Symmetry: C5
Subunit: 203 residues, 5 copies
Amino acid sequence: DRADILYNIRQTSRPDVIPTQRDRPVAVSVSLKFINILEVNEITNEVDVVFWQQTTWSDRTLAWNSSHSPDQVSVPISSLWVPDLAAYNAISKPEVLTPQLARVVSDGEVLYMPSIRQRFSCDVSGVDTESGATCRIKIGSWTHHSREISVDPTTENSDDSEYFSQYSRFEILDVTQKKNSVTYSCCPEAYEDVEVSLNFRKK
Amino acid sequence: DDDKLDRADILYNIRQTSRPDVIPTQRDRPVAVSVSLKFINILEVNEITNEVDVVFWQQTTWSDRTLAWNSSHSPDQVSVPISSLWVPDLAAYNAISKPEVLTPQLARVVSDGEVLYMPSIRQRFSCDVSGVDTESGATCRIKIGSWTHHSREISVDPTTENSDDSEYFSQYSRFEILDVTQKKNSVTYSCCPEAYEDVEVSLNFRKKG
Amino acid sequence: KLDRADILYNIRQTSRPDVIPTQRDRPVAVSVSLKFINILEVNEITNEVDVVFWQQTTWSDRTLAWNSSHSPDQVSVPISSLWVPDLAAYNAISKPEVLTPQLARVVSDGEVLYMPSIRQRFSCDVSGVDTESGATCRIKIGSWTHHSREISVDPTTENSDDSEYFSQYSRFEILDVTQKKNSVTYSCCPEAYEDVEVSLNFRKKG
Amino acid sequence: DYKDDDDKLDRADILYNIRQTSRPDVIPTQRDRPVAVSVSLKFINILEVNEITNEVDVVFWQQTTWSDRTLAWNSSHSPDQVSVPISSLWVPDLAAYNAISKPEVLTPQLARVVSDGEVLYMPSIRQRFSCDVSGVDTESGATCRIKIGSWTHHSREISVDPTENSDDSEYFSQYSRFEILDVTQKKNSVTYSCCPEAYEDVEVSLNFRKK
Amino acid sequence: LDRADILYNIRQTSRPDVIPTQRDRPVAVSVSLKFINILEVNEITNEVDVVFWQQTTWSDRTLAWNSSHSPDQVSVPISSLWVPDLAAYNAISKPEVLTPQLARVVSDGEVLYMPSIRQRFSCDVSGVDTESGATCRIKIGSWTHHSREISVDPTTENSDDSEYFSQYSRFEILDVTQKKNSVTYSCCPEAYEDVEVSLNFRKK
Ligand SMILES: C(#C[C@@H]1CCCN1)c1cccnc1
Ligand SMILES: C(#C[C@@H]1CCCN1)c1cccnc1
Ligand SMILES: C(#C[C@@H]1CCCN1)c1cccnc1
Ligand SMILES: C(#C[C@@H]1CCCN1)c1cccnc1
Ligand SMILES: C(#C[C@@H]1CCCN1)c1cccnc1
């Protein structure tokens, strides 16, 4: 049964084509769950963090009738289209720490949540104060403009207490995740991003 | 065992039957994955940042009975590249570096369908390093389980709950192991409401005096 | 969506990733413009810099063009499906690290747009970086193997302080970035090779 | 034979034959006997030594040989040897039991296949190990032991044999910070409670000191 | 279309894993390093970190074509070609290739391959801080093909590399000599050819 679902997905999946339905934007939901803050440099304004990037979207062409079969399977992301997300202020490659598999649900939803370690250029001033530093990370589709891909945050506000390591030397005060849009003279179109504002301080 | 043509044929059979991307479940039962870490070394410890850099053998076994063959007159086991096999998608929940596999990526397939895979892995973790310079030592806990398969699909079974690991740990390390416990645990999160099984590995160690 | 899959199919039937898309014995005209985002490390002793930049790169392959009167005007395409110019920095001292998805945009008129974010280290003049007038670090980028009859390189934005792109959190600030056509020839390699010479004039803040 | 060694078409046909016959994932056991693998490390350099952590960072040529007689051909009027990418060949799954880094292969991953079926593979490798560095600053020096054998094949499938005493002076960099006093390489066997079979290894004892 | 056809021809005739011996002679490989930079130098450990262009040429006449009315050269991914299995005998890191892995193929069958490489070596760094400078020697040749199969020739035996060497290095090149040499080790009962590169340099 599971082999048959994987076969179906592979027959139907077009890994290089955005799964647009009726010419509508593909809605990509994104939420960073911070796990650790490993290194912070107040002189260079850089941070080194680990987060789970909870990512979901739909490709209805993948759906199947699961009334008498599995309603989810794990799938190598190499078999799937996946959004071309990138952080605008990353200064290192995203290092994926976990198996590169997504879940496909029988209604066509795709769930992908890598643990990623990555370095960013952001405002680290105030990290050793009670009110803390606020490091902003902007994440969006690198090449698809707003007509093609829309990015939506899932949880606008959280202290992340469920996910964050208790052994970090930093503690998280608040994480806000809000829709935002960028445009540059290089690239006329509007591009959606989620702006992740990480408010943290040294313990 | 050393009948070459027999081995080539067994490998051919395994490749015909094996489906590397499909969990080898039967009748909607979870795949039971047994896990035991054998610590070989503790390379770096930072008590300020609560990080450790360690080397361990991850003894992992499970069954896929469709792989089985009659070995009354043929090899009992063969080595097989893991790229030809389904392998559980295990990950450490508090890892802060990629697992660095130090050994050839081969598993053993046994004629009863058991698969045995035991990579030597170097990896860094965020865990409690406080006390490492005391008699009582630090206790660093590491949780390992399937990243994407919940408890109805994969279960994780420890095989060696309690040990001092004296058989495996390097005598030349800066550190010594006091106790290692490996126990069943499960996690659940708001993001992912299913239950996920793991083995919780508690490494009690200290700097040698 | 089937329109988009069809476009990707057409591109792949027509694309020859290993063949330069010359038209009528003309060089392939490649436009290149570096948008600096950050300056991460500078060493005045060794004269080395570690920088992040978006490499805005464009060119045309008119064989890829399609009538888009009733279909998408552009699609994203993995660069492995396309010919891409073999650009390299002549004074790079590390591999270019691409920090972004390796996708290009293909426009229905046959224009290809590729803009990776790259982190890379260079040997250049860092002297004067702690002064008001700053350092001027020059970076030369051109085709590694194709000479000027085969690829030409043109800068698109010859002068800018780059304020739109540069990180406000860097400990450095950019005074000016100039980008100009240049060509080089060595006795090893007796053709003229075109490049863009990028002059990054920057200084430490404060 | 010598006169035909550079006959290109012959070399191409030999490569074809090898790829037709080779089974890269199957141990080339003959006569229900273990595959005899010979291993000899030629130390080229000792790059870093830590007395506190008991770690070394070394470069060595790992001279490795075995036979697969199904690859043999008649070289009376053809090349005696060709270079072959190791991806076309079975290679022993050797690993160092006390390695703490991946083996970094510094050379092209090509082996030689000889017309009698012998395979010769000799990568230059940079790797770090956990071993006894105590005494490195003394005249007697330190003795660092490296144990290398098949990771997954037990003694009935693969045996390992040292190719056993040298100062490696032919190979070792005259410019190193250290000097080699002696290198002995001896057959050995290990077994662990995880893994009930016996596994063969070569134990390489590197006696070295700071200059 | 002409270039696509030349690439198809090269791929039809190229044997990427077979040495292109012509007329039962060794493949004559020319090798010349152009030093671009000297990045780090350690007088205690006798190690250097350098960047060089490795100009490498050889012939495979089976790749030739009539270029009377077609391009004289094309760029080709080296994965489509045989390339000599060159290695440095005293390298202590992997060669890091900094440039696109393409070679030029000339219509007379000459192949030209010149990667920029960053690599670290074990060599004599003594005297680097003196007027006479250090002399770091680097030997590069085929790893697995002995002299009957591959020969290696230097192209410029003497030069100060002023065309190539970075103006902004902390070091300067006094002289670069590149000569034919052969090595024989007890492990391996044949002679292997190499280019011995002597890099005489000093701190500024
Ligand atoms: C773009 C864009 C937006 C703005 C910069 C990052 N995402 C683009 C255009 C063409 C090719 N690649 C990327
Ligand atoms: C999950 C999960 C829990 C939390 C990490 C592992 N178990 C998940 C869900 C969907 C896709 N990838 C991972
Ligand atoms: C060349 C060149 C010029 C000079 C270095 C980069 N562009 C070349 C020739 C043959 C093979 N590879 C590169
Ligand atoms: C083994 C073994 C020997 C003893 C430990 C290392 N080599 C083994 C068994 C099953 C799977 N992988 C490795
Ligand atoms: C050899 C050789 C010479 C001496 C070391 C480098 N080149 C060789 C023989 C068999 C397999 N691999 C390398």
